[PDB]
Write a protein that binds this ligand. Structure first.
Ligand SMILES: Nc1nc2c(ncn2[C@@H]2O[C@H](COP(=O)(O)OP(=O)(O)CP(=O)(O)O)[C@@H](O)[C@H]2O)c(=O)[nH]1
Ligand SMILES: Nc1nc2c(ncn2[C@@H]2O[C@H](COP(=O)(O)OP(=O)(O)CP(=O)(O)O)[C@@H](O)[C@H]2O)c(=O)[nH]1
Ligand SMILES: [Mg+2]
Ligand SMILES: [Mg+2]
Lengths: 330, 340
């Protein structure tokens, strides 16, 4: 179904452009937040469906990465800071992000508030904006300033305070949920949980004799949108270049076999997280369309009853309305 | 060995009692700080040498436990709130701590700043004050107030602000050290690191492909006194009643077999942390002795001449003799301590 909606939405956005009006679906942006090493970058790139974000132990993401997915015929990527070049090898994209980070922050744990801008072109994506962010901390290391914690907090606040921004509150299972930096920030900016999606990672690392059932069932710390558990690649896995299909296969096996979670399998995992996020995106689209539809109808009526040689407007509006109708039918 | 100093020290504090002076030997108060579930209660009871602190997953320690070790030959324990009762079964002590907590906090995650006073009598301990505290958190659960983080923080602050408080900054290895609540707290109250000891737990739970070598080698986040790693019992271990000896054996085996920690094995483990903590305690005592000795000498010398004439010339004021002997006794004990 998603494969049918995506191409229609791109057509509608183009149609709006032809109309030359300040009207857009205003798709919400996706931001990932949480304590350092919570597993944020893994979560984000999994949603996009490509291995391109630097991941590792310790401090990895040291600058915000503003990613704009752009629907296009060709599949490639390009950074704003690299005018001209078109990356087709995503490993090179990952390497470039790292290199661009080191260039500005150095290699002694430093951080920078300056975003790395990346556009990923593909015909199977929504024109979305996703933001990868540095993890929250408590004490400075290397050459970080004494107030590193607040410099990072400020950094993510500028993204998560944006209206409608979908907040991926990432928390590792091998730590008590009550210590979640992700949830604390989420509750400050979105207290009612209207745009917070709880994500519990590292389920495979829990101490023997423990499990996150109460968390995953949305009972330990209830969230309006609930919680979705995932099991991503470990350091040994990253070191060994384990591929995505294999990681996803291991995650699926994990939920189907674990005695504390198999009854929840159908609501756990990376693929299911993708569906949940895509659903929230679809909900925004369908919720925003009626207002636009009516506006376009009003604009059309004027020219329609009157039917400057600007006859194009009639067809442009007519086109947009035809697309909306198709979307409403899916 | 430490078991040599202990007997001497108690006799010293007793000698001062006979003299009616300030026994002193103001030993530092040891407190465990860290995020919720960092493994504080395990570390604390491991140092005491007995299993009696409630440990488990989720929120366990919901009230401060001010524990006073009291040297005594009978070896037992008594709670201030259990007037007239003395426990001999430390497991019953553990149950009581939990029961007493439930009585005031309920069973729905609630906490209370009202400390639980407990005294453990044993001939293998120094008159110390240990403080078990609730783990720091960020978001409330159950019927905890929305300011749970600060109530817990304030609870700890009442103990760790004291100049004479030895801070055991506990942080689990399977979490990033830079995000440690224990280290944030410790740095705020003791920036120089004069009374902070970094304890790293759960090294056995680290992700495959990672290790805490840089941490344990005092290189990632250097502390004045460094770090000591330990491997305590897991939840499964608690459920299975795994005994202390087995846990200790597994911990030692862990450091000796791990390629990243092998060369550090001799500066790692619970027995080592016990030694290090004991060293700081002993050092405090030794720093205090010169002052006490001098004070005693001055007092002695005064009556010394009076005793001299009493034993040599023709004949109650014999309170002097009692004092003479008590003072002599104390100085001798100090002398014995000085020679270790
Ligand atoms: N076992 C296991 N390891 C995981 C899981 N998710 C992430 N990791 C590991 O945790 C570490 C952090 O991964 P990463 O995706 O970079 O988290 P991040 O929060 O983006 C890191 P930073 O906060 O520095 O940007 C890596 O070593 C990765 O292999 C998981 O579900 N299971
Ligand atoms: N595998 C493993 N588990 C550990 C280790 N230390 C503690 N745990 C586990 O962590 C949990 C918490 O232990 P606890 O000693 O209560 O930590 P605490 O910080 O005192 C808990 P609170 O903050 O509620 O008081 C228990 O399930 C225990 O088995 C360790 O070194 N290894
Ligand atoms: Mg990251
Ligand atoms: Mg405890």
């Amino acid at each position: 179904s998603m494969e049918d909606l995506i191409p229609l939405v791109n057509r509608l956005q183009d149609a709006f452009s032809a109309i030359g009006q300040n009207a857009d679906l205003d798709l919400p942006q996706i931001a990932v937040v949480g304590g350092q090493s919570a597993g944020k970058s893994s979560v984000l790139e999994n949603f996009v469906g490509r291995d391109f974000l630097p991941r590792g132990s310790g401090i990895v993401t040291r600058r915000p990465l503003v990613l704009q997915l752009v629907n296009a015929t060709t599949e490639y990527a390009e950074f704003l800071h690299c005018k001209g070049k078109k990356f087709t090898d995503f490993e090179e994209v990952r390497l470039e992000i790292e290199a661009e980070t080191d260039r500005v922050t150095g290699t002694n744990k430093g951080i920078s508030p300056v975003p790395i801008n990346l556009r990923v072109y593909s015909p199977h994506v929504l024109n979305l904006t996703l933001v990868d962010l540095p993890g929250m901390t408590k004490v400075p290391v290397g050459d970080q300033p004494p107030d590193i914690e607040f410099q990072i907090r400020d950094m993510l606040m500028q993204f998560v305070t944006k209206e409608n921004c979908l907040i991926l509150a990432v928390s590792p299972a091998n730590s008590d949920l009550a210590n979640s930096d992700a949830l604390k920030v989420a509750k400050e900016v979105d207290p009612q949980g209207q745009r917070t999606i709880g994500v519990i990672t590292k389920l495979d690392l829990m101490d023997e004799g423990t499990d996150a059932r109460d968390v995953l069932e949305n009972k330990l710390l209830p969230l309006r949108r609930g919680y979705i558990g995932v099991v991503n690649r470990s350091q040994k896995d990253i070191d060994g270049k384990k591929d995505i299909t294999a990681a996803l296969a291991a995650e699926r096996k994990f939920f189907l076999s674990h005695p504390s979670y198999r009854h929840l399998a159908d609501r756990m995992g990376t693929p299911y997280l993708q569906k949940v996020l895509n659903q929230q995106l679809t909900n925004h689209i369908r919720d925003t369309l009626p207002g636009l539809r009516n506006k376009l109808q009003s604009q059309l009526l004027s020219i329609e009853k009157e039917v400057d040689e600007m006859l194009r407007m009639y067809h442009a509006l007519k086109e947009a309305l035809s697309i909306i109708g198709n979307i409403n039918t899916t």
